[PDB]
Ligand binder design. Sequence first.
Ligand SMILES: *[C@@H]1O[C@H](CO)[C@@H](O[C@@H]2O[C@H](CO)[C@@H](O[C@@H]3O[C@H](CO[C@H]4O[C@H](CO[C@H]5O[C@H](CO)[C@@H](O)[C@H](O)[C@@H]5O)[C@@H](O)[C@H](O[C@H]5O[C@H](CO)[C@@H](O)[C@H](O)[C@@H]5O)[C@@H]4O)[C@@H](O)[C@H](O[C@H]4O[C@H](CO)[C@@H](O)[C@H](O)[C@@H]4O)[C@@H]3O)[C@H](O)[C@H]2NC(C)=O)[C@H](O)[C@H]1NC(C)=O
Ligand SMILES: *[C@@H]1O[C@H](CO)[C@@H](O[C@@H]2O[C@H](CO)[C@@H](O[C@@H]3O[C@H](CO[C@H]4O[C@H](CO[C@H]5O[C@H](CO)[C@@H](O)[C@H](O)[C@@H]5O)[C@@H](O)[C@H](O[C@H]5O[C@H](CO)[C@@H](O)[C@H](O)[C@@H]5O)[C@@H]4O)[C@@H](O)[C@H](O[C@H]4O[C@H](CO)[C@@H](O)[C@H](O)[C@@H]4O)[C@@H]3O)[C@H](O)[C@H]2NC(C)=O)[C@H](O)[C@H]1NC(C)=O
Ligand SMILES: *[C@@H]1O[C@H](CO)[C@@H](O[C@@H]2O[C@H](CO)[C@@H](O[C@@H]3O[C@H](CO[C@H]4O[C@H](CO)[C@@H](O)[C@H](O)[C@@H]4O)[C@@H](O)[C@H](O)[C@@H]3O)[C@H](O)[C@H]2NC(C)=O)[C@H](O)[C@H]1NC(C)=O
Lengths: 208, 202, 198, 205
Amino acid sequence: VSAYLSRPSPFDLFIRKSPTITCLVVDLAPSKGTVQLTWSRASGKPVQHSTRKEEKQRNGTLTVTSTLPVGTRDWIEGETYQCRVTHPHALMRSTTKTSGPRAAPEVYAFATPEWPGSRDKRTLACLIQNFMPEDISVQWLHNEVQLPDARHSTTQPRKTKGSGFFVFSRLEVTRAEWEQKDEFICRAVHEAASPSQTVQRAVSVNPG
Amino acid sequence: VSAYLSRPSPFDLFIRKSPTITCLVVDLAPSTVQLTWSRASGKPVQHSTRKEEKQRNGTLTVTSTLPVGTRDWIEGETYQCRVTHALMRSTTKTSGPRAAPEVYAFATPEWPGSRDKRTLACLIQNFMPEDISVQWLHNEVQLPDARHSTTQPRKTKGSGFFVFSRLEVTRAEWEQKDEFICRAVHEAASPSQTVQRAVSVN
Amino acid sequence: GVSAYLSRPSPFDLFIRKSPTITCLVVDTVQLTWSRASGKPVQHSTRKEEKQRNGTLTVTSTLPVGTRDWIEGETYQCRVTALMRSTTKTSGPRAAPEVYAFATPEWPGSRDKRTLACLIQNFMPEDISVQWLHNEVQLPDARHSTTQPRKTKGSGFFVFSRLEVTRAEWEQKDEFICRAVHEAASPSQTVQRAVSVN
Amino acid sequence: VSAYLSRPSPFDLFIRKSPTITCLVVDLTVQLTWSRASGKPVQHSTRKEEKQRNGTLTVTSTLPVGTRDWIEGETYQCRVTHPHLPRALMRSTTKTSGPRAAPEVYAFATPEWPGSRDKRTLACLIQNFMPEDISVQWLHNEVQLPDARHSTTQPRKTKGSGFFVFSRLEVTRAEWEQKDEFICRAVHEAASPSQTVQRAVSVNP
Ligand SMILES: *[C@@H]1O[C@H](CO)[C@@H](O[C@@H]2O[C@H](CO)[C@@H](O[C@@H]3O[C@H](CO[C@H]4O[C@H](CO[C@H]5O[C@H](CO)[C@@H](O)[C@H](O)[C@@H]5O)[C@@H](O)[C@H](O[C@H]5O[C@H](CO)[C@@H](O)[C@H](O)[C@@H]5O)[C@@H]4O)[C@@H](O)[C@H](O[C@H]4O[C@H](CO)[C@@H](O)[C@H](O)[C@@H]4O)[C@@H]3O)[C@H](O)[C@H]2NC(C)=O)[C@H](O)[C@H]1NC(C)=O
Ligand SMILES: *[C@@H]1O[C@H](CO)[C@@H](O[C@@H]2O[C@H](CO)[C@@H](O[C@@H]3O[C@H](CO[C@H]4O[C@H](CO[C@H]5O[C@H](CO)[C@@H](O)[C@H](O)[C@@H]5O)[C@@H](O)[C@H](O[C@H]5O[C@H](CO)[C@@H](O)[C@H](O)[C@@H]5O)[C@@H]4O)[C@@H](O)[C@H](O[C@H]4O[C@H](CO)[C@@H](O)[C@H](O)[C@@H]4O)[C@@H]3O)[C@H](O)[C@H]2NC(C)=O)[C@H](O)[C@H]1NC(C)=O
Ligand SMILES: *[C@@H]1O[C@H](CO)[C@@H](O[C@@H]2O[C@H](CO)[C@@H](O[C@@H]3O[C@H](CO[C@H]4O[C@H](CO)[C@@H](O)[C@H](O)[C@@H]4O)[C@@H](O)[C@H](O)[C@@H]3O)[C@H](O)[C@H]2NC(C)=O)[C@H](O)[C@H]1NC(C)=O
């Protein structure tokens, strides 16, 4: 049995201004009975109502999730939020905003050339590197509209040669999409980015 | 304490081909509530997902969503949700006359004080049975569900049903492309179980 | 058990007829008693019992209230004989309703009937009365349906109203009126829109 | 106490033709014993145990395996026994089954970023291959660059049935000035005929 507590996504925190944190509890057996996830703030001040979700996995695991809305000013000013896991057959996790040097991300967008026999599709790629810390949100937009999250896949932050991190994002598109409008935007949201914590670059397929 | 059990979304059933059913329990006072799925035939059920939320008025709203087999549902299996704390709800595919929906899409003229926004309205009516999904598209791409609101199906004066859908749009959207689509997914719609109408702000 | 509900006056009764009433509805010798927060006396109320199809017993008490008393913010209470419900005018900001009326085009194979739709939106508070008129004669309530007020993306509310009309009606006069009654509507709490089938 | 058993790298298996596998024991006196599912003999293995700065001891054993033995489907077994553990840990490894598909390879060069006039980042997209095992080499001056010069992401599913990785390599001005050609080479069992697919890229046109 292991538990994890995440920080707010930069998109939710800075753009949407509705940050949430998630207590993710993975139960191995799972022992009979209901797990309890209890939220608190280090200050002892009130917390909002949380959402709870659980589902039995294919391999037999019970996965439990609790998502807590947090105040925007509360989080940025350094509040510590705590998740307590209770199971009869005690785990404590906490989260607060990281401290340390900040660095904005570099962003680059690319499009693959045509692969023989696959005329109706291309792969778009985005390199986002040299940012600090590793918390970052990546989105893809078409027609100034964000595409669904499941359309793309973004790698985990790996360390660069020095202090910074990098991620790669991949988005498969169709010929119908780029013929409707041949411009796609990779957008990164990061605490150290400027202005408005947003950095974005565009790419076009430029078909023959 | 009341319980509800919904049939699959026509969009999930006919387009996504991954239908689900949802058991919703609304409880006035908290005390855990168990929601057990079973089939009238006795055959196995898949793993369901469970959600809980304490609402602003202090109520434990509990939802459980169960994937069902596509053929199993169309062939007419009956599924039961049993609530232990005993409430029993069942659901199955409707049987009876079918009628395709009529779709009408409208745009409001400019109102004083709202220069940069219009409201689109969609009237879908005279369909049978009542199960229907309503979607809005722009640039032939579906908008997020939160952008619009849709009423629950209600009886017409005759034998069909009607729903209204509302979508607020911005000047930036209709300037980029002045065409919005109200699309309905319904089992009787032909072809492809879908019928749609376009509307422009002009 | 039982649920008890207490409603506010309809804007049509409050502003046009100037004869507002509030209704205490209890759903199953049940007793319903009225009182005011100020301690002033209440008027005589009307009690009504009806048997529902499912067998449940429905009891209502309808109390006339003063026009100035309600608008100035009096609180009225219905005590059920354990149960207590209160009602008062909703405070907060005001906004007048926008009214838009629409007519469906002729649908294939349905030449002798047509559907009118009225969208009323961005008003607050949510209390609103919706009427349909033909030749300045108010049509019976059962001819139309109106949704319950729901939040827009902003602060105001919206409702949809639906009226099926006949060929005989629009041949006699092809003009129908969607009328809304609302506290913030100016100057006499009424805004309306005309619509034609063709 | 957990145990992990790896497969050989495609580079070791197909280019160098000297494959090895590694049995890793974490959170642990531990004994690691190798055997083959066929019953045929194993070679000598090398052992290295290193105490970690979080209270954990790790033991690593690397076993050389036959090239044809592995390609023809031998199963290798690592069994962990220790007094503290009640039940012995058993792990096995064999080549991945299932359909095969060669990788597509694409190589890009970033434009200049402010404050980095003397360096560029190269990126290689390798996608739609299966199974997921893959190696990447970068070549300059007709020879291979050291492995620590680049980083490759973990294999991830495409929308279809294949996998993709990205490979990242930072190059210096002196390198592309000396010769402006860099080669991203993928090593994969489904790449025909020599288990390699490569693409060249230049910093400037
Ligand atoms: C304290 O606060 C809480 C929080 O607000 C509050 O909890 C609510 O309690 C009420 C109690 O009545 C709940 O209301 C009920 O909800 C039932 C579930 O509705 C869902 O399922 C509907 C069926 O879906 C099928 O059909 C559609 C259409 O064909 C299809 O698309 C679907 O895919 C599926 O096949 C569905 O229609 C409905 O959707 C409406 O709401 C969603 C909300 O997001 C919206 O997105 C939709 O556009 C649409 O507007 C929803 O998904 C519902 O079945 C039930 O309806 C009964 O009553 C009506 C009355 O007219 C009848 O017409 C109907 O036939 C049923 O008999 C009823 O509406 C409500 O769900 C709770 N809220 C939440 C969030 O759970 C407490 O009450 C509060 N406590 C107090 C006040 O004391
Ligand atoms: C205390 O500190 C110790 C460290 O001192 C720490 O120990 C770690 O424990 C975690 C527990 O999960 C270990 O993680 C597992 O590692 C498995 C081994 O695979 C890794 O190592 C491979 C061999 O590395 C050698 O070679 C490389 C260069 O070749 C060199 O840099 C190394 O130093 C070493 O010499 C390596 O090849 C492998 O990378 C390949 O594979 C991954 C995919 O797994 C791919 O993404 C890579 O691109 C590359 O192709 C990898 O780095 C690993 O198999 C295993 O992964 C499975 O399990 C996890 C969960 O269990 C799943 O998430 C995953 O998907 C797989 O199913 C897992 O990641 C870690 O290796 C230990 N590290 C060390 C140094 O021992 C403790 O955890 C700390 N805490 C405690 C309480 O003790
Ligand atoms: C049985 O199957 C289960 C489901 O497949 C397995 O559960 C998985 O267990 C792993 C590790 O035990 C979890 O991985 C962790 O993920 C969290 C969070 O990752 C997500 O959130 C971050 C930030 O919020 C986001 O950036 C990522 O993209 C993810 O969306 C990490 O913090 C951990 O370090 C770790 O990587 C899986 O999340 C978990 N899956 C589920 C569905 O719960 C289980 O391990 C299997 N068990 C056996 C015995 O086979």
